[PDB]
Structures are given as C-alpha cells and as structure tokens.
Amino acid sequence: SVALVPHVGMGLETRTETWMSSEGAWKHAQRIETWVLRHPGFTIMAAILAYTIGTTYFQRVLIFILLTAVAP
Amino acid sequence: SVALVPHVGMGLETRTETWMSSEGAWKHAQRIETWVLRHPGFTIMAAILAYTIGTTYFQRVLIFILLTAVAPSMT
Amino acid sequence: SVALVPHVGMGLETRTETWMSSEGAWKHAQRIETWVLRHPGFTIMAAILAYTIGTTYFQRVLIFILLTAVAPSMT
Amino acid sequence: MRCIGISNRDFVEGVSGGSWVDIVLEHGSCVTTMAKNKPTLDFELIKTEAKHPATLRKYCIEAKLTNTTTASRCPTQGEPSLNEEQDKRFVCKHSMVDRGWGNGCGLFGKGGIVTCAMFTCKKNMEGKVVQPENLEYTIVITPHSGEENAVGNDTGKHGKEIKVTPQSSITEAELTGYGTVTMECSPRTGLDFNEMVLLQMENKAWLVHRQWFLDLPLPWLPGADTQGSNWIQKETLVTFKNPHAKKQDVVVLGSQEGAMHTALTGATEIQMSSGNLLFTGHLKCRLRMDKLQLKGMSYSMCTGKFKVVKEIAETQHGTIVIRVQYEGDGSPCKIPFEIMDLEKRHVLGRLITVNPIVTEKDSPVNIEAEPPFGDSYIIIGVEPGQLKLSWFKKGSSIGQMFETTMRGAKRMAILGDTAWDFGSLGGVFTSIGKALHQVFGAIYGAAFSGVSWTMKILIGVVITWIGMNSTSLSVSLVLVGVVTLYLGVMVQA
Amino acid sequence: MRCIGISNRDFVEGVSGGSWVDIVLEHGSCVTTMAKNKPTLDFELIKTEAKHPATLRKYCIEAKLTNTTTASRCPTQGEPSLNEEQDKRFVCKHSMVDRGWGNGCGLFGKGGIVTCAMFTCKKNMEGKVVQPENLEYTIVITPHSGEENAVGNDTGKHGKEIKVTPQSSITEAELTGYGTVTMECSPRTGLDFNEMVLLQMENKAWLVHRQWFLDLPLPWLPGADTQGSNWIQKETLVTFKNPHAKKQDVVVLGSQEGAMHTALTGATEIQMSSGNLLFTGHLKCRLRMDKLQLKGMSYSMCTGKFKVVKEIAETQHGTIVIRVQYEGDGSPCKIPFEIMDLEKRHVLGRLITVNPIVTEKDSPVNIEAEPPFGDSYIIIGVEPGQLKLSWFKKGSSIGQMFETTMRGAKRMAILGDTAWDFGSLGGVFTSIGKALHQVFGAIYGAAFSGVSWTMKILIGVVITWIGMNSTSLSVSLVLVGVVTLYLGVMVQA
Amino acid sequence: MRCIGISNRDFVEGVSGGSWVDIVLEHGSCVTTMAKNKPTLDFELIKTEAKHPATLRKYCIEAKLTNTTTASRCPTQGEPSLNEEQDKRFVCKHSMVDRGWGNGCGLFGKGGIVTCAMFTCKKNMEGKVVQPENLEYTIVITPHSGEENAVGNDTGKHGKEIKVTPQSSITEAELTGYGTVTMECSPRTGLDFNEMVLLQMENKAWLVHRQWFLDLPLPWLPGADTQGSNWIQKETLVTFKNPHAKKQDVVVLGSQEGAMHTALTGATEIQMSSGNLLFTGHLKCRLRMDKLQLKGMSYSMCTGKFKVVKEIAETQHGTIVIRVQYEGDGSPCKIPFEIMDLEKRHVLGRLITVNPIVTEKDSPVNIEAEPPFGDSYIIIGVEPGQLKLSWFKKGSSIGQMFETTMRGAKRMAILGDTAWDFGSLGGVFTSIGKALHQVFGAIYGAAFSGVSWTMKILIGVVITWIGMNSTSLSVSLVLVGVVTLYLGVMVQA
Ligand SMILES: *[C@@H]1O[C@H](CO)[C@@H](O)[C@H](O)[C@H]1NC(C)=O
Ligand SMILES: *[C@@H]1O[C@H](CO)[C@@H](O)[C@H](O)[C@H]1NC(C)=O
Ligand SMILES: *[C@@H]1O[C@H](CO)[C@@H](O)[C@H](O)[C@H]1NC(C)=O
Ligand SMILES: *[C@@H]1O[C@H](CO)[C@@H](O)[C@H](O)[C@H]1NC(C)=O
Ligand SMILES: *[C@@H]1O[C@H](CO)[C@@H](O)[C@H](O)[C@H]1NC(C)=O
Ligand SMILES: *[C@@H]1O[C@H](CO)[C@@H](O)[C@H](O)[C@H]1NC(C)=O
C-alpha cells in the first residue's frame, strides 16, 4: 500500500499546513495505544523480555518502547 | 488509515491461503529495505546509538534492529 | 453542579460587598463542623492515621486537618 | 460636601510641582482633596456603564425533556438506532439491558439500548463581554461650597458630573466659582474587562471572571447562536437511569438557578436590566489643580453675628460639621472661622470647607473642619456676638496613625499595587514601592488564585510555622505568612 | 477415490473398540479412512454455509461532501455558529483564523471559524454476524469403489453428500453397497462464529475477526440503522484544512476500498454474493464405521485374466493407482491383488482400495495401493495369466517418518488443540496431549496475538538466545523459542 | 499596511551601509520593513507559479481486469505458457495446482498453472515536474501610506505587485509617492523544483518529493506514454489467489485514492487546476531602499484638530492601529503623533507608519504605532483640541524577548540556514552563523531524513540521556538532544 510509505520526513515542509497534518500527527500514537489495549499479552511479554535483555533501566525501557512500537 | 491496521495475527488462519498472503508476507521487510536504502544516514545514526546504549552485543543488535524497524513504521 | 465551583478566589474583589459574602463566609467551616459531629468514627481514623503518617506533631496535625477537610468534600 | 457622611472616605492633601495629585476613586468610596490655596473638592465615582455588550455564551439553567424515544438491540448484534440521534436537539445515551426470550430476543446477554429525548431550554443565562473602550465612568465633583443642603447630599445637583471614557484622557469640568478641574483618568486599568463577563440570569446580574464563566458545567449556546436549540453538553442537565439493567429512562434535572446563586458567591452583583451599570471597582485619576481657584476671595469678612442652626457633629473621620446662619449685613461675605485653644492664642485646627462664605443672608452655611485631638474651640464671626464653641475630640495621634496604617493596608488588599497611586505626588519611593508591589503581587496572585480565605489562613499559618522554625529565611517567611494571614482575613471569600 | 490427487490428503487408519474414529475435515483437504474389514472412505468438507446473517455494522468507504457552509466570529466573542451544526449529517470543525480591520473585524486576533459540509456515503461495506446454530456443513463421502471414473473425480455423483448442522448431532449416509456411515460432527467448535464477522465489500467478502472489524477507523452505522445517514466518526473520512489561518476548508478523503484490501491482508476471502459460502476452516467429526460393510465381501475370487488399462501412477503421498480390466468369467468377483517382495515370498504392500471387486466385466477397476519403499511386485489375478508388475518407490521409511512429523506439526500449527482429535481413538494420551495443548495454546495465544510473522521470528530468536545463555529454564526457553520460530515460518502473515 | 492582521508578521529593522536588507518571504507570512529615513513597507509573497510542467509518470490508482486466461501443464512438464505473458497489457502469475487422473492428467502431482488478465487503468494520478527556470513569484509591496482602506487589505490595489523569475530575479517597483524599491531575489534557492513533483490526483494537487514519488508502489506509465498499454508493476494493483492449490484466479485491488491521501500526509497541497499555483514555500530577496523616499517629508505639521474615526486597536504583535480624520486646514500636512507618558515628559513608543500625513482633509488616515509595555498615551495633533488617548499594553519586555527568541527558533526550524538571511545586513557573524548552520544542517538533514516527529522525540530523548551520562561530549549531546526534541515538537509530521 502507498499508505504505508507516507510523505513524512522529506524536508519539504514549509510554514504552510501540510495535507493531513493535524490528523496524522497522533494517528500512530493512537494506533499503538489501541493495539496495546487489544493485545496486553504481548505488552506483558515485551516487558519481561525488555527486563531480561536490558541491563540498565534505560536499556530496559528503550527495548520495551521499541518492542511495543514495532509489534502493531 | 485502515491499511495501517491489517488483519494480521488474529488467530483465524486456516490452511486456506489468506487474502494477500504473498504480498502481506514480505512487504514490510521490503519496505524496511527500501527505507534503509533511501536513508542510510539514519541507519548509521541508529547503529551509533545502538552501540552506545547496548552494554552487550546482543542488546546492541537488538536495539539497532528495532530502531531501524520502528523508524519507517512510525511514519 | 455549578454550586461546587463558586466564584471564589478570582481576583476581581473590590471594596463592594460580594454576592453572598456573609453567607458564604463560614459555610465551609460550618459544613465541616456538622460532618465531624455526624461522622466521628472517621475523624478518629483520621486522627490515628495522621499520628501514624506524620513524624512531627506539625506533620500530624496538618495531615489530620487536611484529611478531615477532604472527607466531606470528595463527596 | 457630598463626601461628608461616607464611612469609606479619604483625605488627599497636597499636589506635586506640576500641581497634580493621583487619586483612586472606588465605588462606594469618596475622596476629599485639599491643597494650600485650592478649593476643597469631593470626588465620587458613582457609575460605571458598559456599552455595546456582545453575548459570549448562553447557558441553560432550566430545561425540559419531550418526545422521549428508546430503541433496543439484541446482544452481539451491535448498537440500536434511533433517528433522533441525528438531531442534536435530542439528548441521547447508549446503555446495556438484559435481553432474552422474555424480552423478545433470541439470545441472552447484554443488548444495547438507546434512549433519546428532545432537549428544550426553558430559562437560560447570558454572559456578555464589553470592550474596554466601551466603558464610561461617571464621576461627580463636589466643591465644599458650604451650601445649605450639600452635606452628604447624593440626590441633588450640587456637584458636577463628568464622564470618563477611554476616548479622551483629559476630562474637564467647570466648577462655577472655582474655575476648572482637569482629570486625566485610567479607564483601561480599572477592571480588566477583557478578562470579565457580565453574567445576566433572570433579573439579576454579576460581574464574573471570564474563564470561570467558560468552565461552568451547564448546557450552552455560543453568543453567535440564533436558533436557540443546538445546546452543547446537554447531558449536564439530564440524567439517564438504568437502575436494574432492564430499562433506560431519561429525566431532566431541576432548575440550576439556585445552584447558580451558590456558584456566584464570591462575585460582585451588577445591573444589566436597563443598561450594563456597574457600581463596583475603581478608577485611577490624575487631578490637575492648575485652574482651580477659591470662590469669593474678593469678599470682605462678615461683620454681623452668626447663629448655630445645626449643632456641631463629628464625622467618622474626626472632622466636624456645623451649620451657621449669618444674621448681619454685607452678604456676600467671608465667614470668620478658626479653631483655637481656650486662650485664643494658638490656631489648633484647619478648615476643610476652606474660605467659607455666606452667599445669601437667609441661606445657612455648612462648614467642615478638622479639630485637634482633645479640647478645641470653634471661633465663628467676630465680636460682638462671636460664637465660641467648645469641641472635644477623642483619641490621639497614635491611634490615628494606627488607623491610617490599617486604612492603607486595607487599600493595598483591595487595590493591590494600584494603592501606591492613591495619594501619589510622583515620588521615587512611591515608584519603587509600586514596582516591587507589582512583582510580589504577580507572584502572590499566581500562587493563591482560586483558593478560599480559609485556605489562605491555613497556608499562612503553615508558611509562618515554616518560617518560625527555620534567620534570613525565618524573617522572609514569617513576613510572607503574616501578610498571607492578613489577606486571608481581609478577603471576602 | 475423490481424495486421490489432492496434495493435502491424510490417511486415518483404524477405529476405536467402539468402531469409531475421530477426524477433522478441512476445506481444501481430504481424509481417507481405513479400518480392518471396513471399506475405505474418502471424506471432503466441500462447503460451509452461513444462513440468516444479521448486520453488525456498516462502514463507509467512499463519501461525498456537499452543502459546505462556514461562519466566523470576531476575536474574544466566542464560537461561531452554523445552523448545520445541529444536524449530524453535517461534519463540522471549529478552527481559528486571523481577524482584523481587513476582515471586517474591529479587533485583531484569532477569531473562531466553523466549517460544515453535508456528509453522504457513496459506497459502504457491511459486517454481518451469524449464529453458530445457523451453520451448515456439506461433507462428501466417496468410498473406494474402484469405479472407472472415480479417481480424483469431484464432479460426478460418485460420493454421497451430507449436511452437518447443529440441529442434529448425527448425520447418516447410506452408501449403496457399503452400508450406512454415521458421522457425529462438531459444527459449533470449528470457526468460532461468535468472534467473527462476515465482511462484505463491493463484490468480494472476507471472514474477519469481530473485534478487529469493530476497530476499523471509518465512518459507521449500526447494523440496526435504517436512515443510512447518521454516520459515526465521519471525521475519519474527511479532512479540514486551515493552511495559513486565513480560511478553513473541508474535503472528503478518497475511496478507502483499496486501503480496505490492504487492511484485509491476513483474512480469508469468502463468498457472500448469492448465499454466505465459506470454503475455509475445519469440521471435527466422529466417524462411526459399525454399519459399514465391504462391498462384495461375499464375492468369490476372480479366476480369469486381468489387463492393465491405465499404467501404475504414483500419487504425492507414495501410493499408486492402477486401473485394470477383467477379461475372465464370474463377475461380480473379487480381484486378487498383492504387493510382494522380489522373492514373491512376503506380502509387502497394503491395499487402500480394500476388497477391490469387478462388478461388470467390461467396466475397469481403479485400485489404489501403498507399496513399500524400494522394489516390489504388484501381483494382479491368479495364475495362469497373473499380472506381475514391477514398481520402484523412491524414498525411505526414515524420510517418511520425518515427513509425517512435519505434517503433524503443521496440523497443530493450523488446528491448535483440535489437531489432537485428528486420528483420535479416544486414547488417554491424546486427551492429555490435548489438555496440555489447550493450556499452553491459550497462554501462547495471549502472548503472540496481533503480531506479524516477522515479529514471531524476532521474538523466537530472542527467546532462544535467552535460553542458550541461561538450567531447566535453558531447555524451556530454547523449546519455546524454537516452537515460536517454527510458528513464524508456518503462519501466513 | 497589508501586513496588519497577519499573525505570521515579521518586523525587519535597519538597512546595511548599502541601504539594503535581506528578507525571506514565506507564503502565508508577511514582512514589515522600516529603516531610519525610509518609509515602512509591507512585503507579502502572494503567489508562486510553476509554468510549462512536464509529466514525469502517471500512476494508476484504479484499474479493471478483463480477458482472464489460464493455461495448465501436467506435473513434471514444467511451466505452461500463455500468449498473454508477452503482452505487456496483461499481468500474469505462475502457480502450482494439484493434478491427477481426476484432472485429465496421467501423472499425479503439482502441475504448473499460469493466469493472465488484461490490465486497464480507470483512474490515474499524474506527477509533473517543473524546471526551476519556469517559476514566477509574485510579491506585493504595500507602503504604510495610512490610506483609509489599506489596513489588512488584500482585496484592493493599495500595493504594487512585482513578478520575480529566475531570469528576471532583480526587479524594481515604483511606489507612487515613495520612490522606487529594488528587490534582488534568489528564486533558485527557495525550493528545489528539480527534487520535487507536482502530484495531481483527481481534483487535488500536492507538492511532493521526487524520489518518494518514484518509489510509489503503484502501476505507472512514463510521461510520454499515450496509449496506456505498458503499465509498469501492474502486480501492485492486483492479487492472484490460489486458495487450495486447485485453481488460480486474479482480482483487481480497489481504488487507491484514499490510500494515496494517507500517503500524502506530510506533503503540502497545491493548486493544479487554473495553472500550477503554489501558496507554500519561500523566496529570499535582497531589498534595496536606496531610491526609497518618505512621502510628504517637506510638508508642514497640521495645526488643526483631529478626530478618531476608528478606535485604537491592538494587533497580535503588540502594535496598535488607529484611524484619525483631520478637521483643520492646510492639507496636505504632517500629522503630529507621539506616544508619551502621562506628563508628556518622555517619548515612550515609536511609529510604524513613519511620517504620517494628511493627503486630503476628509480622507481618514490609518496609523500603526508600537507602544511600550504598560501605560502610554497616544498624542495626536497639537493643541488646541489635541487628542490624548490612554493605552495599556499587557505583557513585559522579558516575555517579549522570549517570544522573539521562539519566533527566531521557529524560523530556523522552518527555513533552516535560510533563516540567517531573514533580516541580514551582511555581517561577519551572520555569514559564520549561516555557514555553520549549513554544515550542521547537512549532518542533521541526513541523519533524520524519513523520520516521523515521534521518532525525533524518541531519538532526541535518547541522545539527551547519553549526554546527561557522558563535559565536552556531555554538553554537545544535550544540545543535539534538546535541538532534536525542539524539532520534533515543531515539525508537522
Ligand atoms: C414531539 O411530540 C409532539 C406531540 O407531543 C409531536 O407533535 C411532535 O411532532 C414531536 N416532535 C418530534 C421532533 O418528534
Ligand atoms: C439635596 O439637594 C436637593 C437640591 O436642592 C434638595 O432639594 C434636597 O432637599 C437635599 N436633600 C438633603 C437631605 O439635604
Ligand atoms: C444542499 O444544497 C442543495 C442544493 O440546492 C439544497 O437543495 C439543499 O436544501 C441543501 N441541503 C441543506 C440541508 O441545506
Ligand atoms: C467424473 O465422473 C462423471 C460421472 O460419471 C463422469 O461423467 C466424468 O467423465 C468423470 N470425470 C473424470 C475426469 O473422470
Ligand atoms: C478480450 O475479450 C473481448 C471479448 O471477448 C475480445 O473482443 C477481445 O479481443 C479480447 N482481448 C484480448 C487481448 O484477448
Ligand atoms: C480594500 O480596498 C478596496 C479598494 O479601495 C476597497 O474597495 C475595500 O472596501 C477595502 N476593504 C476593506 C476591508 O477595507
């Protein structure tokens, strides 16, 4: 789908409002939220894995966030 | 978009071939590979950050793969 | 209710007497007073908890006063 | 002479090199201004009119429900649908009810139910906003003319009414016999009407904080709305009951008018019935005495006798008023009037009604004066028949100093940093006090916005206790706590 | 013989003491059942039908905006109002635009603007739900009759068709010459249709997860709706634009049909045009063979000569089909048939077409048999005139056991716990294996729900690595990661 | 006076020694320039036009399939071939299908199957490219003439429009009464149209990155293609289905218009219906004021009375505008206008409309001025009848320095290193600053290309955290960290 390769991060943005800017700002943050609420099992498995792999708490939280963001 | 929430991982899969089984198989990995081939400078930075954050080589490679995968998906 | 959000503390007060200034003056004090007399059990539990949470009698008295004031207000 | 009798009265004395003095006129207060060779004047802000108000928002305080409809849906089959859900006039709620074979459903479980009713406002309240350039302040300027029916007379045409607007800094009034009074006032800094709403319920009106008004949990329409029916947050005025998961009913809540009267507690009531009339707030004004002259200075002193027709009476501020009638010839003439000791050696008190004159023989004259504390004698006329009237003033300079310090502290509580302009001649210790007050006032206003007086008292005691148990920090916090406690004691809510 | 030619073919051998066996019939698959002295039978689930679907929700995928109106409001004077905001057929939005003298506004600043357009669906898709009691499965039961046109023949009336509905646990079929086959199937435990939606878009249809369907970001109507115009979350299909805070516009988004196809990626396409027909999923059945009988069990042996009329052909599962014709006398008779070693000493191969018979002399007979690996002799008829046919079978028993292990693993990857029912004779180890699969599968399903196959591969590598660097935990994590890795390679998406 | 009312209004003060100033004009923004002896000019870039566009490629967004044709082979015979596999009008795919005796085959096994279908685009989107040389920028220059209808007026002919092309990029505008202004613009350095595509879908258009446009996963034709029979990558818009390895079919995917709208998220919409009009992007220009002159500078000051015909109004940038009308004689004359304290001792604010004049007695004059923070008095005319208008300005100088800092930060975010040109007078610090920003802009603009704002926030926090944990390297990474966190908060996508 073309929808999976949006026109984001292209360095053509001006002060002019872009096409679906207000909509598409949080759509990925709302999508991940809907998914975590629908699939807590993975988020629980993602926490245990992020705890085990990461040594420091920064690594753990970073691995957890990345895992949770890749999964949906 | 609905295309952002595809019917993958729902537990309804039978032995029958699903709707776009061929395309829904390697599209994401091809999208990641096309993205890295268009943005090598982020991949260098993600590699640099993974190496810095990870204390072990397993963590670093895991942080690198996730950062590289996350970035074209977060768009 | 709107009655829960009075126009109090808004920084528009003049020397002119406000709408229910005499009325509104001691309503909250009289309201807390009646509540302690109708619910003395909670005030004891508040006193016990205040003595336990606070290390100094200033901490203990403050926690008791705040806990006694919050109880008929969260209602 | 219109100030004489007002408890909230202030005596401003002296002008600057430029012959001006800053004053703050409050509603319900009054200022008497004095200067060495100038007539005494009385100033009262008597009316603040807001003109051309725009409706910011209407709020429904009493509604009714009609046309109640409901629709159910079998379990697992989704949501029920009512056509009324499309019309926003209708308030609607989705709930769940037990469905089964007895309810005409083929499945058992929670099925969706929707109830809708037509919402109609019966009574609403409107909040109007005015622009600061559409304010008109009315000030009455009353000279101490000594006129027979002038003392405390607010129902007569004794003074000159002037209209202060933002359309002109300089307001000028002709005082017949006293030249011209010039006032440059500050109408754009009396109240911040860009932050205020003129709230009109049934027959009453209040001046309310705009953000408080915009947070009122009631159904509303925009001030732009003309249809009167597309009410926002209608569910604030209705309840849906599904008590036993059998049936969903909707009922309207009662009139919130009394509940709104409770919400308006710390607000100041105004008049919006026949024009937006405000009798609250203050106006800062610079008074220019350049063109003020005493009246009747070219008269000779009166020679005949005077008789007291209204006995000496003390005001609440330690001045005295007396009404005398001239019995002699030569009117118009100047009344001989001094306040002396028993030996008539030392002059002890000054005139408030400076240069009192008889304009007509049969017209008695009211004279205000400030006697010293203790024994004084009011010498009226000359011999023969000179009146000599003993007066005793209770109190002392120490008690008057403390009462002055409490009146000034009370003025700072009400006016904030604007109090520094009240009798200001322009000193640098008034400029520094005002700028420092603006700084501590902004930090205090941000820290205590929204809290009641009992919370100010609590925090004041807590801050004082912190300071008391802390040397430099101890004094700086005990002081903040004491001022916080004073302001918690003085604030009306 | 209908199974012969299908690559997804299973052989279920033997029944329980009660002469039953459990089978799971999948769409696109086929099961061949064999038991001692019972006829061989072929079972195919060829049709699943859903009847009487209720509409759960319509989604708009292509809309049209008309009647675009806009209204403004000067700054500080609140919200603009359009009459259309009361109608929910209108999608509206409040934004801010710059205002000033050039815009007919006495004030400068951000003023409120509202744009409303009427939303109208052009194309929608419907989600339908069906009750499990309204399912009907069609099974075709074809015996191994050896009939000339029966090998892999899915068109003719060689097999018996039976309907499996929840309205009767027992389905019986009279197979002419074979007695009666009794099947007790589980039409409620195939696809869980209470968790599923039959999604019909333009001319295609998909079986989808019900909760996924209820989370689709499109404008929707409840299935109960009749007006067709009160769309929920129309904003998902429109976009308002305020490019420079000068003017607000609204435009409908394009048709989302193509995006829905991308969304439908991992779902199974079904038919909904003329009847709700599903050709996916499985049916667990208990096959009862007690009333089955070998056809021509009471025939004497053929003594005449046979001729091969279609040369031996190997199927994908290592069996061989040959067609022969009897030339002798005494029809109907039983064909002598044996697979022997090269010495003609041991019988090495089992028949699949058990008790092959000649019914009419000039009607050739198809005989499926399973030879051993290596060389063997297919012996047909008696001497003299016996046919001695050489056959080599590539492979080995070791390779077959590995391929049986993978088919078993793949059946578990698809059926889950139901895979333990597949050739089940009610044994105690199979009920234990099923129960442990149900608890491990429930836990595994909660932890990997929603993730794609690439994520399962990543997680499998991660978990296997945490076990390889770990203890009993080291064999647990390596087992869990390896099964996870295998399931990521096996799952379609 | 056109700039008055725009929220994206910038004030550039001061010319260089060469009497020039560098400005950047953004669509939707506007620049007000003023130097000591020069008239105040408003500059707005109101139109970018791209001329003579060439189609780069057409992408197909909606196709139909026709003429489906299949060919099969028996197993072991390799892949079948259709004639249509060499016809580029057809999309084809090879699969495997079970064969056997029931399928007309002598062997059993996977036979090759090929399905082809003719591809016909129904709807396409066109991506055009413009050469940088065919750009035409329109700039309107409005002097602060005080003319009555000019405040925020864009629907009039108050200003002079200049056209700027890469060929004639230096042009002069004769401002009637105000001399001549020269603009030396650099239209090749604002937007790089060699890297951009003017993407036209059905009735909407977007400016999009060229490499992203060529990476679109849709069927495409080269721009020269006129027949539509050679669509590249038709497989992106179709799917072949072989559900049960039994039969292959091909279906066209649905319309991709709504998926393309999603794909166009962070792109800027343009207009490609009445010519290729862009209302986005910027133009960097060198403004030459050498031949500028203040109008009516030889006039004497007005001595008559003025009246306010439109009340003082504050703009969003802390300036005020007022419309006065002259009532005296001696037109044309200079308007006496000052912003002073209450005693008129100090001059507190300045004019924006420098040298305000009365051209005709009855034509009102608009005057913009910048008052100080707090109280100030707008003094208009000379006594007798002198206008004295109180004005209060909320805010402070400290908060203004924060707003100016944020407005500069946001400009660097939008314009990158071009922001160093915005009010440049050609200093060494500006050149050094711009050169460093070009280098850090290259290292940053490569590391963050293709990344969303959330990924910028995450990386910004990660980078900041590494800096807070490891002093030379620590301050560097916290700076990169906090600049990355700022750019993630500021970017639109
Ligand atoms: C409401 O009910 C009245 C009858 O009481 C009926 O006449 C009217 O048409 C109804 N209106 C709506 C909008 O249903
Ligand atoms: C107030 O002045 C008016 C005007 O002369 C007079 O009629 C009235 O009696 C006076 N009232 C008092 C109380 O002096
Ligand atoms: C929409 O526009 C059409 C065009 O004439 C008009 O007939 C119709 O009444 C409009 N609809 C509404 C709800 O105003
Ligand atoms: C399938 O069986 C039917 C029924 O007799 C027959 O007509 C047809 O020829 C058979 N087809 C094949 C391929 O054997
Ligand atoms: C497609 O089918 C139509 C109708 O049968 C036919 O006229 C046309 O020639 C076909 N085109 C091709 C390329 O086969
Ligand atoms: C803008 O200028 C034109 C030209 O004179 C005038 O007709 C129009 O009324 C002006 N508009 C405003 C809003 O001042």
TrEMBL record, chain A:
<feature type="domain" description="Envelope glycoprotein M flavivirus">
    <location>
        <begin position="2"/>
        <end position="72"/>
    </location>
</feature>
<protein>
    <recommendedName>
        <fullName>Genome polyprotein</fullName>
    </recommendedName>
</protein>
<comment type="subunit">
    <text>Homodimer; in the endoplasmic reticulum and Golgi. Interacts with protein prM. Interacts with non-structural protein 1.</text>
</comment>
<feature type="transmembrane region" description="Helical">
    <location>
        <begin position="44"/>
        <end position="67"/>
    </location>
</feature>
<comment type="subunit">
    <text>Forms heterodimers with envelope protein E in the endoplasmic reticulum and Golgi.</text>
</comment>
Automatic annotation (TrEMBL), chains D, E, F:
<feature type="transmembrane region" description="Helical">
    <location>
        <begin position="442"/>
        <end position="468"/>
    </location>
</feature>
<feature type="disulfide bond">
    <location>
        <begin position="74"/>
        <end position="105"/>
    </location>
</feature>
<feature type="disulfide bond">
    <location>
        <begin position="92"/>
        <end position="121"/>
    </location>
</feature>
<feature type="disulfide bond">
    <location>
        <begin position="60"/>
        <end position="116"/>
    </location>
</feature>
<comment type="subunit">
    <text>Forms a heterodimer with serine protease NS3. May form homooligomers.</text>
</comment>
<feature type="disulfide bond">
    <location>
        <begin position="185"/>
        <end position="285"/>
    </location>
</feature>
<comment type="function">
    <text>Required cofactor for the serine protease function of NS3. May have membrane-destabilizing activity and form viroporins.</text>
</comment>
<feature type="transmembrane region" description="Helical">
    <location>
        <begin position="472"/>
        <end position="493"/>
    </location>
</feature>
<feature type="disulfide bond">
    <location>
        <begin position="3"/>
        <end position="30"/>
    </location>
</feature>
<feature type="disulfide bond">
    <location>
        <begin position="302"/>
        <end position="333"/>
    </location>
</feature>
<protein>
    <recommendedName>
        <fullName>Genome polyprotein</fullName>
    </recommendedName>
</protein>
<comment type="function">
    <text>Component of the viral RNA replication complex that functions in virion assembly and antagonizes the host immune response.</text>
</comment>
<comment type="subunit">
    <text>Forms heterodimers with envelope protein E in the endoplasmic reticulum and Golgi.</text>
</comment>
